[PDB]
Design a protein around this ligand. Sequence first.
Ligand SMILES: COc1cc(CCNC(=O)c2[nH]c(-c3c(F)cccc3F)nc(=O)c2O)ccn1
Ligand SMILES: COc1cc(CCNC(=O)c2[nH]c(-c3c(F)cccc3F)nc(=O)c2O)ccn1
Ligand SMILES: COc1cc(CCNC(=O)c2[nH]c(-c3c(F)cccc3F)nc(=O)c2O)ccn1
Ligand SMILES: COc1cc(CCNC(=O)c2[nH]c(-c3c(F)cccc3F)nc(=O)c2O)ccn1
Ligand SMILES: COc1cc(CCNC(=O)c2[nH]c(-c3c(F)cccc3F)nc(=O)c2O)ccn1
Ligand SMILES: COc1cc(CCNC(=O)c2[nH]c(-c3c(F)cccc3F)nc(=O)c2O)ccn1
Ligand SMILES: COc1cc(CCNC(=O)c2[nH]c(-c3c(F)cccc3F)nc(=O)c2O)ccn1
Ligand SMILES: [Mn+2]
Ligand SMILES: [Mn+2]
Ligand SMILES: [Mn+2]
Ligand SMILES: [Mn+2]
Ligand SMILES: [Mn+2]
Ligand SMILES: [Mn+2]
Ligand SMILES: [Mn+2]
Ligand SMILES: [Mn+2]
Lengths: 181, 181, 181, 181, 181, 181, 181, 181
Amino acid sequence: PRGSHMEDFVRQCFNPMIVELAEKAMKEYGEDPKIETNKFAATCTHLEVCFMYSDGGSKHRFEIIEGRDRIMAWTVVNSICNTTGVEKPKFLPDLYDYKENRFIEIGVTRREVHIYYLEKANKIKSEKTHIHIFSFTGEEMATKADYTLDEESRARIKTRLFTIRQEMASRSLWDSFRQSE
Amino acid sequence: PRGSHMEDFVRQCFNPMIVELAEKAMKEYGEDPKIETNKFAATCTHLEVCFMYSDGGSKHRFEIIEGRDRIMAWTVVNSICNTTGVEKPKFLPDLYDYKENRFIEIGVTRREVHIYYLEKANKIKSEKTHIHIFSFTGEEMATKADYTLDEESRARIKTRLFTIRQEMASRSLWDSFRQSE
Amino acid sequence: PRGSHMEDFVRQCFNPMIVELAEKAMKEYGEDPKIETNKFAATCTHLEVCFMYSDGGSKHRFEIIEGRDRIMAWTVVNSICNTTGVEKPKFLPDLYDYKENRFIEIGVTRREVHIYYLEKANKIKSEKTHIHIFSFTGEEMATKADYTLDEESRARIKTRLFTIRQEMASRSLWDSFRQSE
Amino acid sequence: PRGSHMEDFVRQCFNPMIVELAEKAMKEYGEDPKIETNKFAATCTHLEVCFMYSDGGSKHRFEIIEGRDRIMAWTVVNSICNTTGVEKPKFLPDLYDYKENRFIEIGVTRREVHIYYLEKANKIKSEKTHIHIFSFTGEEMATKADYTLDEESRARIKTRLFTIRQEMASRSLWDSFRQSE
Amino acid sequence: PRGSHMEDFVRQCFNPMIVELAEKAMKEYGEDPKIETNKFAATCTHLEVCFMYSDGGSKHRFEIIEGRDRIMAWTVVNSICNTTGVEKPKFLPDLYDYKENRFIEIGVTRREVHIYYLEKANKIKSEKTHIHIFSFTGEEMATKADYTLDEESRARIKTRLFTIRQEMASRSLWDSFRQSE
Amino acid sequence: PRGSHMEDFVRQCFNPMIVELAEKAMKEYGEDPKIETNKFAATCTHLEVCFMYSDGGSKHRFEIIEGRDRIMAWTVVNSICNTTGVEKPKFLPDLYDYKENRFIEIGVTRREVHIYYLEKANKIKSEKTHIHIFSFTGEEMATKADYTLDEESRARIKTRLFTIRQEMASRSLWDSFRQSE
Amino acid sequence: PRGSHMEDFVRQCFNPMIVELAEKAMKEYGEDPKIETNKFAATCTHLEVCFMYSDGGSKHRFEIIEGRDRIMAWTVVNSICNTTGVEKPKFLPDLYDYKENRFIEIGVTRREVHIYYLEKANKIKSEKTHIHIFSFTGEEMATKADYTLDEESRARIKTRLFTIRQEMASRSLWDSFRQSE
Amino acid sequence: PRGSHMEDFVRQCFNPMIVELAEKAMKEYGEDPKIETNKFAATCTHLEVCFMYSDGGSKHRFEIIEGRDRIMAWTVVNSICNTTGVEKPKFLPDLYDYKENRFIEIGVTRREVHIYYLEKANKIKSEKTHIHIFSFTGEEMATKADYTLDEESRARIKTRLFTIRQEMASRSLWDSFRQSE
Ligand SMILES: COc1cc(CCNC(=O)c2[nH]c(-c3c(F)cccc3F)nc(=O)c2O)ccn1
Ligand SMILES: COc1cc(CCNC(=O)c2[nH]c(-c3c(F)cccc3F)nc(=O)c2O)ccn1
Ligand SMILES: COc1cc(CCNC(=O)c2[nH]c(-c3c(F)cccc3F)nc(=O)c2O)ccn1
Ligand SMILES: COc1cc(CCNC(=O)c2[nH]c(-c3c(F)cccc3F)nc(=O)c2O)ccn1
Ligand SMILES: COc1cc(CCNC(=O)c2[nH]c(-c3c(F)cccc3F)nc(=O)c2O)ccn1
Ligand SMILES: COc1cc(CCNC(=O)c2[nH]c(-c3c(F)cccc3F)nc(=O)c2O)ccn1
Ligand SMILES: COc1cc(CCNC(=O)c2[nH]c(-c3c(F)cccc3F)nc(=O)c2O)ccn1
Ligand SMILES: [Mn+2]
Ligand SMILES: [Mn+2]
Ligand SMILES: [Mn+2]
Ligand SMILES: [Mn+2]
Ligand SMILES: [Mn+2]
Ligand SMILES: [Mn+2]
Ligand SMILES: [Mn+2]
Ligand SMILES: [Mn+2]
């Protein structure tokens, strides 16, 4: 344990509440944020994107599933299913859209949004669950070209993603981060 | 007094301000939250629903009548009546709709929304007061099919209701809660 | 000094910030809130109405002139005039409407809105300044029937006014308050 | 160092966070707020205008570039460029408009908005960057007559500017401030 | 209900947390603070004195028994008894002195401290429980002349008591308050 | 009104709560802080010294009389008198010492502490009231050479006084301040 | 997972910060607070006692070792050792006493303090580390009869311990808690 | 600029207020915290030690000179001198001891406390100014062996110093930090 300068960057780069939430998620899965630090930065990035995503749109539009502990998120998923009638997904998604009546799986990738979306779409058999991918280069890929949010909201997410990339490269940790996924 | 694990659940499940407001309501009616704990959970659930309800819509759209002490709520009801011209209801309602110019009676039930609405509609002789029922299973029933709020707002209330049900069943207190109303 | 139970009511009835602002206004005009307590309650009521009024509408829609000290309010009035081109009013108004490009004089009365509006309209030679009157009975009177705000926003002001009236009558201070203006 | 009453005015006139941000900006450029106090008041005024500007419009509409340190602002500019495709400006702007897809250069002047806009438009070779000028007299000048914001929002900025002018003249520091730019 | 100007004084005179605690105490005993207002002022006064009392002395010196609900205070009393060995009192006291190893019964009276102490000492058969009386005139009477606290601390309590008396007399509610105990 | 740079200094120099308290004191006595600015700085300085004074010593040692409005301070003085037995002073003092059982009159002077103490001792016929003088040069003069407080506490007051003097001289307002008392 | 009413009690009984710290400790050791709930209550109780313990005595007297993550606590232990000269303990203790120059191992037991102290003293070969045991019945056992703290401070810990016991028995979870250690 | 992982450590290691104060100090002296990062960590360490130092002892015992801007610290030094009579030091010290009537120069070193004290004692011609040195290894050296503070307070400073050393070595930045002074 200890020694990784990715850890000090992650702590100085991200909101402290997001960092505590990423630590719980990895510790729930038997991973050490001080050891697997590239996944520590990835879990923080994925968490923040999900939060800025639900921040886009109306006030009660989304239900945040990511960031809850495994049991609570599954409890909320059931309540959404058993009241809207939508089918229970096989894997925990990140958001639910009360406006569009679908769960959203949000992906952040260090490669082509084409490959990651292929990978994630091959995982969920429920083609009903919406998929929305973002990349650190500025691209995005969504189901049926339905990007759910306003252009301005998704622009904010892509900008924040590129800033995190620049700050990693400035600290010479980006190359290890990209060649880690 | 003391001993009920419904009490510890109610305290861990609901917002602490809602719990203090439910305690005042029952104590105003000569009921002990530590003894009649199923009504303690019911008064909390009814309180929260009324609060998420007024949270739906515009900022000045509703006037919260529930949660006030008996004298203050009746004082506010008079002021609404003596300025809008609407008729003074026989029983204290939960909300007033400045947008639709009617008081709202909000009901949460552990049975069919059909029976509860029948019961509540038979209580208020003023057919002018709007009735909106929710259930722990996900159904809702409103006057003239006028559901007052957006689909997304009512979806949030139904989801929260089903989560409270799951958490009660997980603690094996749901069966006593349903067969108590 | 001391002894008036209107003073304890005013302090328990109104927001503490509004009470401090009313005290400064009267003390600026050589009046004692502990002695002239009916005007103390009136200045609080007028202050709150002006605040709920600017709270109606959009975020940057109004400029609050009431509640500022005499020099600062006149400084803001000049800045509004010397940038919008509107004529400098002879008497300090309460609000300025950036949406309608006019100053608003807000009146709260214990008699007919017809008489008070006549009185206030006879004071301002600038017929450009908008006048909006409210009463403790629920009536309102505005210039050119232009009520500036939504129906729901003005309904909130009339309700709050009637609650203050009920609370005064319950404390038997209303009759002295009405027969004091 | 010390002695300037422009400094005490700037501290009493502006928000303390804006004052700390102006001090960092000048100290980054080798200027002393206690010595060059007219620029200290100017940097505060420019900062506040940029902040009320981004406050106009929608919640995620703008990206604040002014107020960041030189490296961070340039990092954010790159992220905006490398994700929107817009060209990297030669000089750091103040805002980016996600709604209009352009950087905004905001100018505050003590002379004609005609001269200052001429000066600033001659500096940026990128005619793509939008320019919006304000003056202490109440005028404004924008690119292609596209004023970006609502009439009410820009009216607030012009009023605040004229209040700062009045407060300087009342302290007899305005004449030195105008004949300093 | 409603109408008593003792109620508005009690709310303006006492800390709002103390007022909420007095309301719970009376409502636990089937008393209405809006009806029995002299006892409402008395319960507030007794509560504050107990709080300034525990505020005297060292940080962990006292255990506050007053202000807790009946079940919780009795739970704490047992824990003090079953760990210190002191005898369980027949009636709930107000404080426990970890420094002197005794429960303290704190009395506030509107008559002679001689009579009230006689009354309270005749109620507790446990002569082990310390008694400390205060009056609105400035006198105090304690067991074995052991006044537990510093002279300066008890002086603060007597001063606060006399201020409450003056404020009641100024509002002409003192005579009803004294001839009510 | 307006124009004095002593006003901007007073606002930037003193705690904002002390400034609000000084404004109320002068406005209670028919004085304008924007006009009589040397007294505005003096009332702030006297207020702060009284506050750092009560901050010296134990927690319940002093009762702050300065800073209260005239009626409330006299109410507290009576309560101190009618419970300690000390004689009611002819003029309102600043503090009461529960440890030494005497009221304290605190003076801040711009001349010799010898002259000011002579002046203040000639005003109070009650030789029982303790007098403690401070100067902007670093001297102090107290009754019976009883300086009430620790050496370190009074050293802090003298240092703060000399800093206020330096800041005034740096702004060239000290000479007017000294030749104003 | 889920179902244990010990969990709802632990959450309603203990400070929320202590509950988060207990969850991290168990999750660091591969234990689930929702499954092993008796240890969840035990870790909370041990945590609180350590905190009230360091709260006793002077402000800088102790260094809290418990509650830190394993790496940070060991880092602090080294710093204490490499600056005071004390020997590095084989097992992580809970506190360090700057006043007595020794680490403290704090134990809370559901049996005789005699047995637990025997067990813990047999674990640490460093007889230099001080041991202080508390029980839920009110007993305590310390090294060389040196109880480190004042009588009043340890009395508070024993009382709090007995209250937790009563609240568990009232919820019928005490018998499982005692027969679990 | 940018790239140093000492910067991310300094931000994650130290209190954010101390980091802002260190940045102002270096920027006042024409140094970049992002470039000269070893001095950035040193200025933070020196700042924290000075703060824990003044935290030792009584409440009004010290006057913090470090952390103020150059003009303000010199203003406070004059006020201390012109009221206590102590001689004005040639170089700005860190603290003033109201209890011992001397300025304190606090040094933190990465070598022998013997050499650094020799260096610092050779700089101040005023042998009246007290010198107190700390090292990252746990040693300390003070004037006349007068260590000013309690043993426990200085023990806390030495421990914190050794923790900062361990955290630097764990990040492999300690060797560059020690061989930089
Ligand atoms: C190593 O496995 C884990 C999983 C979790 C929770 C997973 N739940 C999700 O929902 C999830 N995870 C990821 C993801 C990532 F952010 C980084 C690396 C690999 C990933 F799959 N991307 C998503 O988009 C997503 O929705 C926590 C810790 N470790
Ligand atoms: C036992 O009687 C009471 C009544 C009150 C206030 C009643 N005022 C309402 O307004 C109210 N009550 C209820 C309700 C409930 F939430 C639980 C059980 C039975 C109910 F009728 N449902 C509503 O929908 C409603 O509007 C408080 C305590 N006890
Ligand atoms: C002396 O030079 C500086 C520059 C900076 C940052 C410049 N960056 C801008 O972006 C900037 N500056 C100015 C501006 C001003 F506010 C006052 C005087 C002269 C100016 F050019 N007006 C703008 O409109 C603007 O966008 C900080 C300190 N000193
Ligand atoms: C009407 O009876 C009640 C009792 C309680 C709680 C009693 N528990 C005490 O501990 C208590 N009560 C009183 C007291 C008083 F403050 C006012 C009137 C009469 C009193 F006896 N003086 C004390 O000194 C005291 O210790 C609450 C409401 N009503
Ligand atoms: C112009 O008269 C006033 C009086 C008050 C309240 C007086 N009450 C005191 O207690 C008081 N006043 C003064 C004092 C001063 F601070 C400045 C100038 C002259 C003074 F006498 N020095 C004290 O030491 C003192 O105790 C408020 C406004 N204006
Ligand atoms: C199952 O093992 C663990 C250990 C830890 C951290 C141990 N570190 C200590 O320091 C520690 N633990 C315990 C303790 C307890 F509180 C409950 C059960 C058994 C125990 F030994 N009593 C102490 O007194 C103590 O000092 C966290 C989670 N699980
Ligand atoms: C490069 O020069 C500077 C100086 C300052 C303020 C100096 N004023 C002091 O008071 C000061 N400085 C230092 C110190 C240090 F912390 C790191 C390196 C060298 C040092 F001398 N040690 C002290 O002990 C001390 O009292 C700020 C920035 N850069
Ligand atoms: Mn995802
Ligand atoms: Mn209802
Ligand atoms: Mn008006
Ligand atoms: Mn600009
Ligand atoms: Mn009592
Ligand atoms: Mn005085
Ligand atoms: Mn232990
Ligand atoms: Mn130093």
